[PDB]
Amino acid sequence: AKIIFVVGGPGSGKGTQCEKVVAKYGYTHLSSGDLLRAEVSSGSERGKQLQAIMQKGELVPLDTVLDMIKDAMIAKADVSKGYLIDGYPREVKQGEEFEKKIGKPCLLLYIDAKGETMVKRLMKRGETSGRADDNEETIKKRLDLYYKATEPVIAFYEGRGIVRKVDSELPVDEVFKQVSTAIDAL
């Protein structure tokens, strides 16, 4: 099955673009973020641990998040001809462990947005949906964390040869025209 990594900063537009991809190509959208939040909503002690980490805007340990990705992948396994892995990997070791335990990605969609643009979007979603990590201080924390840990992931897969960059400063469906182009050329 096709495994696509979709990687980019906070509020760059990963989720948005992934759901457009689902609607058009019928890939299976797996959000590490959605998976983690669902474990939070479960009421477990683990959820309490994950909620604390996410509220501070830090990386959840590789073991937890890779576990959930693999689980979800295995569940949707008999209906998926493709997978969109949204927001994983976020550090080089995550990409390495994914490859050891699951498989190699066909493509990495690099959803590229300016830092200020990302702050603007998250600041807006913060005032509307009231996601706990969208407060101003946590945003700065998520943004710095993206620059330090997740950018080398982009380098890693550029060395692999599979990164395609899309300009996420554009209007949403102009962005998606780029995503479509990258996916069509598989």
Ligand X SMILES: Nc1ncnc2c1ncn2[C@@H]1O[C@H](COP(=O)(O)OP(=O)(O)OP(=O)(O)OP(=O)(O)OP(=O)(O)OC[C@H]2O[C@@H](n3cnc4c(N)ncnc43)[C@H](O)[C@@H]2O)[C@@H](O)[C@H]1O
Binding site for ligand X (CB under 6 A): 8, 10-16, 31-33, 36, 53-54, 57-60, 65, 87-90, 94, 121, 125, 133, 142, 168, 170-172, 175
Q: Would you say 81 or 160 has its CB closer to ligand X?
A: 160
Q: Would you say 44 or 81 has its CB closer to ligand X?
A: 44
Comparing C-alpha atoms, which of 5, 10, 6, 4 is closest to residue 113?
10
Q: Would you say 154 and 163 are in contact if contact means Cβ atoms under 8 Å apart?
A: yes
Q: Would you say 81 or 148 has its CB closer to ligand X?
A: 148
Comparing C-alpha atoms, which of 20, 18, 19 is closest to residue 4?
18
Q: Would you say 8 or 105 has its CB closer to ligand X?
A: 8
Q: Would you say 81 or 174 has its CB closer to ligand X?
A: 174
Least CB distance to ligand X at residue 105 (A) = 14
Least CB distance to ligand X at residue 179 (A) = 11
Copy the structure tokens of residue 35. Answer: 């998976």
Least CB distance to ligand X at residue 30 (A) = 11
Question: Within 10 A of 53 (CB to CB), how many other CB atoms are there?
Answer: 15
**Alpha-carbon dihedral angle through residues 66, 68, 70, 75, given to the nearest 10 degrees:** -170
> How distant, in Å, are the alpha carbons of 35, 89, 136 from that of 68?
7, 13, 28
Copy the structure tokens of residue 180. Answer: 């479509």
Least CB distance to ligand X at residue 141 (A) = 9
Q: Would you say 89 and 153 are in contact if contact means Cβ atoms under 8 Å apart?
A: yes
Least CB distance to ligand X at residue 110 (A) = 12
